[PDB]
Design an enzyme around this catalytic site. Structure first.
Site, PDB file in Angstrom:
ATOM      1  N   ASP A   1      -9.345  -1.977  -3.609  1.00 31.93           N
ATOM      2  CA  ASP A   1      -9.697  -2.042  -2.359  1.00 31.93           C
ATOM      3  C   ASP A   1     -10.055  -0.827  -1.503  1.00 31.93           C
ATOM      4  OD1 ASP A   1     -10.001  -3.555   0.053  1.00 31.93           O
ATOM      5  OD2 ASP A   1      -8.061  -3.407   0.728  1.00 31.93           O
TER       6      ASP A   1
ATOM      7  N   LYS B   1       4.557  -1.773   9.350  1.00 34.78           N
ATOM      8  CA  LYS B   1       3.935  -0.797  10.184  1.00 34.78           C
ATOM      9  C   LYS B   1       4.084   0.519   9.979  1.00 34.78           C
ATOM     10  CE  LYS B   1       8.103  -0.937  13.292  1.00 34.78           C
ATOM     11  NZ  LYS B   1       8.622  -2.314  12.593  1.00 34.78           N
TER      12      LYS B   1
ATOM     13  N   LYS C   1       5.793   4.145   5.823  1.00 36.34           N
ATOM     14  CA  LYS C   1       5.578   2.689   6.028  1.00 36.34           C
ATOM     15  C   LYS C   1       6.984   1.731   6.007  1.00 36.34           C
ATOM     16  CE  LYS C   1       2.639  -0.724   3.706  1.00 36.34           C
ATOM     17  NZ  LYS C   1       2.051  -1.175   2.640  1.00 36.34           N
TER      18      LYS C   1
ATOM     19  N   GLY D   1       0.816  -3.809  10.758  1.00 37.32           N
ATOM     20  CA  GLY D   1       0.124  -4.897   9.940  1.00 37.32           C
ATOM     21  C   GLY D   1       1.321  -6.158  10.291  1.00 37.32           C
TER      22      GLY D   1
ATOM     23  N   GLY E   1      -0.157   2.541  12.937  1.00 36.91           N
ATOM     24  CA  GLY E   1      -0.476   1.429  12.351  1.00 36.91           C
ATOM     25  C   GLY E   1       0.247   0.297  12.330  1.00 36.91           C
TER      26      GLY E   1
HETATM   27  O1  X5N Z   1      -1.917   0.480   5.101  1.00 37.66           O
HETATM   28  C1  X5N Z   1      -1.176   1.626   4.975  1.00 37.66           C
HETATM   29  C2  X5N Z   1      -0.132   1.602   3.947  1.00 37.66           C
HETATM   30  O2  X5N Z   1      -0.353   2.858   3.308  1.00 37.66           O
HETATM   31  C3  X5N Z   1      -0.481   3.990   4.081  1.00 37.66           C
HETATM   32  C4  X5N Z   1       0.032   5.196   3.601  1.00 37.66           C
HETATM   33  C5  X5N Z   1       0.084   6.478   4.624  1.00 37.66           C
HETATM   34  C6  X5N Z   1      -0.749   6.081   5.702  1.00 37.66           C
HETATM   35  C7  X5N Z   1      -1.169   7.089   6.864  1.00 37.66           C
HETATM   36  C8  X5N Z   1      -0.920   8.650   6.391  1.00 37.66           C
HETATM   37  N1  X5N Z   1      -1.251   9.366   7.425  1.00 37.66           N
HETATM   38  C9  X5N Z   1      -1.710   8.490   8.383  1.00 37.66           C
HETATM   39  C10 X5N Z   1      -2.475   8.712   9.634  1.00 37.66           C
HETATM   40  C11 X5N Z   1      -3.015   7.615  10.369  1.00 37.66           C
HETATM   41  C12 X5N Z   1      -3.024   6.363   9.759  1.00 37.66           C
HETATM   42  C13 X5N Z   1      -2.267   6.005   8.669  1.00 37.66           C
HETATM   43  N2  X5N Z   1      -1.815   7.201   7.777  1.00 37.66           N
HETATM   44  N3  X5N Z   1      -1.224   4.951   6.117  1.00 37.66           N
HETATM   45  C14 X5N Z   1      -1.258   3.859   5.278  1.00 37.66           C
HETATM   46  N4  X5N Z   1      -1.659   2.787   5.667  1.00 37.66           N
HETATM   47  C15 X5N Z   1      -3.046   2.955   6.199  1.00 37.66           C
HETATM   48  C16 X5N Z   1      -3.410   1.937   7.545  1.00 37.66           C
HETATM   49  C17 X5N Z   1      -4.698   1.910   8.243  1.00 37.66           C
HETATM   50  N5  X5N Z   1      -5.841   2.132   7.395  1.00 37.66           N
HETATM   51  C18 X5N Z   1      -5.714   3.282   6.031  1.00 37.66           C
HETATM   52  C19 X5N Z   1      -4.294   2.907   5.080  1.00 37.66           C
END
Ligand code: X5N
Ligand code: X5N
EC number: 2.7.11.1
Lengths: 319, 319
Positions: free
Chosen positions: A128, A19, A35, A15, A13
């Protein structure tokens, strides 16, 4: 592309200013999600919000909340090494497959309620909660994610106010009222339950004004396929008056929540003490190069450093 | 968003003038991958090559080549509904996990060689064979993808010229020389074999000039762990003179390809006639609303329309 003990792989992902990348831990081979936050573009207010998020992640340790393993920090970048949830967002799962049958929704919702009630035990509100922030691991267990908007809440305090996703926002949030915290999370969980069982949101609009009007009236449609017990449970979450909204500890005794779990009633999570004495794992890490004394110092002080991360990852199954 | 009988889901890739999205077929529930091309961005020359790719995909039917199920065309957009390969690119697999043992490389390479030799049987040269275009299905079977740069090759003619990925390009391509067709695929397959067994490219450089000089010299390093049989097989692919390069039908007999495959020597694929008479699937489609006679007409004329796609998808396992 390495950072510390991690080989960076594909982007999960993106942002603004951050990222998320999947990665492999070099020493153990375990997969993680990292992250990556570019600190150079953050003002001092955003920077303090960032360190607040880290402090919250260190407080929370629950099997259905994304776990923090390690923090790596440079002058320019912050790296938060966390659990990887290989089956993605509940939001995408509902989009692809439609509504869950109530048996499946119940399994997920028991984990969701446990995790959020546990947050409230720790005086943390998520603020959220939405389908997009519920992740699924390889066995379809819930992992609640993104505490970037979360906060502590205090006795005699009211929260600085913020609006997450409007479809999940409690009516008091639309009216700009001060609130304590947990009751707002409870409302969001009512919206979540409705989306799990129906595949759709209970309150919607063509624009924010129409959505707001519908939330404040508090009326929503019960599909014919929804059970009476599920309908009755929803009435405990989606109460306009936050004073009369159910608390999660009360809601844990609900008939629908416990159907098929009659000798295993849902109850507040009891955090076990962390076993930091697994000599089998310590011996492995001594073979890697860390000293026995270094390992015991990092683990006893819970440093979220390269040693404690290695120890925890050795306690997780391979992929 | 829907297109025809398909619900569009997450994006799998975004390139120049096209994107690939995963999707679900509404009628059967099967997953697919849809290449989505905005025709409004293309000049008439690009538009011609686009319909060339479709014609090539209709010619090829092999278990290790991504299959075309359906074409949907509006004034602005072309949709190519294709097989979905859930385990991604061999390129990413090598990056994450390193080199394959020769027995694992052998299993993939037999499938790769079968698929490409089959293309050459059909007088099709792929021209962009590289780790990124070898996909992996749920069972780690190879699926060759992206025929966007492929062409027919003919007796008496030389190819229009084009540059695939430089690290995989045959030496004659670096010298602007005209070429027949299949010999350039053979060179690329030598590079692929090297990358499967070593986890690295045989020819690299800091820039194109340096890469070019190494390819033209044709020298590459043999790792100590590589068997003599694998080294000898590489010599049949990575021949500087295209005239003296082995053909895939000859290379199929090689000792390394067939080690441990008693009574199972690799041989040119024999494409069976498509069974278009499975009354169990037709009965399901009649239940859906298509007429028995419409189904026979679409299948007999192999239209790649909504009917033939449904029939083919019903013959695939749920996943
Ligand atoms: O914004 C954040 C920050 O905290 C995170 C911590 C772990 C992960 C994560 C762990 N395993 C996966 C697999 C696919 C996508 C994200 N993750 N993600 C986030 N995100 C996502 C981003 C999209 N919406 C849900 C939260
Ligand atoms: O360029 C194209 C056009 O033809 C395709 C046909 C099917 C698929 C496809 C099927 N299943 C998956 C899973 C992940 C990614 C792509 N696919 N892809 C492409 N692509 C990819 C995109 C990335 N590079 C390799 C080729």
């Amino acid at each position: 592309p390495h950072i510390g003990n991690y080989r960076l792989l594909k982007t999960l992902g993106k942002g603004n200013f951050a990222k998320v990348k999947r990665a492999r831990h070099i020493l153990t081979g375990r997969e993680v999600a990292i992250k990556i936050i570019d600190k150079t573009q953050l003002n001092p207010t955003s920077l303090q919000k960032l360190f607040r998020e880290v402090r919250i992640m260190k407080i929370l340790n629950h099997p259905n909340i994304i776990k923090l393993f390690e923090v790596i920090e440079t002058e320019k970048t912050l790296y938060l090494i966390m659990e990887y949830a290989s089956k993605g967002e509940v939001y995408d799962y509902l989009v692809e497959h439609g509504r869950m049958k109530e048996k499946e929704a119940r399994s997920k919702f028991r984990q969701i309620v446990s995790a959020v009630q546990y947050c409230h035990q720790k005086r943390i509100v998520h603020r959220d909660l939405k389908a997009e922030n519920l992740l699924l691991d390889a066995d379809m267990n819930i992992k609640i994610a993104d505490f970037g908007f979360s906060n502590e809440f205090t006795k005699g305090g009211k929260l600085d106010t913020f609006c997450g996703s409007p479809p999940y926002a409690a009516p008091e949030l639309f009216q700009g009222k001060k609130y304590d915290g947990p009751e707002v999370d409870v409302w969001s969980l009512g919206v979540i339950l409705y989306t799990l069982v129906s595949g759709s949101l209970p309150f919607d609009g063509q624009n924010l004004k129409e959505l707001r009007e519908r939330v404040l009236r508090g009326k929503y449609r019960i599909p014919f396929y929804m059970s009476t017990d599920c309908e009755n449970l929803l009435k405990r979450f989606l109460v306009l008056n936050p004073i009369k909204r159910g608390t999660l500890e009360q809601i844990m005794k609900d008939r629908w929540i416990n159907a098929g779990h009659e000798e295993d009633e849902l109850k507040p999570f009891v955090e076990p003490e962390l076993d930091i004495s697994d000599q089998k794992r310590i011996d492995i890490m001594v073979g890697m190069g860390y000293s026995q004394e270094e390992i015991q110092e990092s683990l006893s002080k819970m440093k979220y450093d390269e040693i404690t991360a290695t120890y925890l990852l050795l306690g997780r199954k391979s992929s």
